[PDB]
Write a protein that binds this DNA or RNA. Structure first.
Length: 88
DNA sequence: ACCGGAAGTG
DNA sequence: CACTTCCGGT
């Protein structure tokens, strides 16, 4: 059709614009910054969505680190599980 | 917890 | 490609 596979940063935003996932992941601090409150839950869902049952935060976080070079994401240093989108 | 290299997947 | 898997560092 024109369908690519579901990107992880698509999937993070999908969750982050839904109040029914605030317990798991939410916006915090500055503009574009977010926090994972339940790292193991996020990964489980990202495993469910990609039919990859052995997914976990170690593997998911690697995925996120590959976004640093690509200028989609980066880390907020000091704050745990706190990344921030590159909207500039 | 967080990093990044390296090989593997489809 | 866009991750997944694995794992040796700080």
């Amino acid at each position: 059709p024109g369908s690519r596979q579901i990107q992880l940063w698509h999937f993070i935003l999908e969750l982050l614009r839904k109040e029914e996932y605030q317990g798991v992941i939410a916006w915090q601090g500055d503009y574009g910054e977010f926090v994972i409150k339940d790292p193991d839950e996020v990964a489980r869902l990202w495993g469910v969505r990609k039919c990859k049952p052995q997914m976990n935060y170690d593997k998911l976080s690697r995925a996120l680190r590959y976004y640093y070079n690509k200028r989609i994401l980066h880390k907020t240093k000091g704050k745990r599980f706190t990344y921030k989108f590159n909207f500039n």
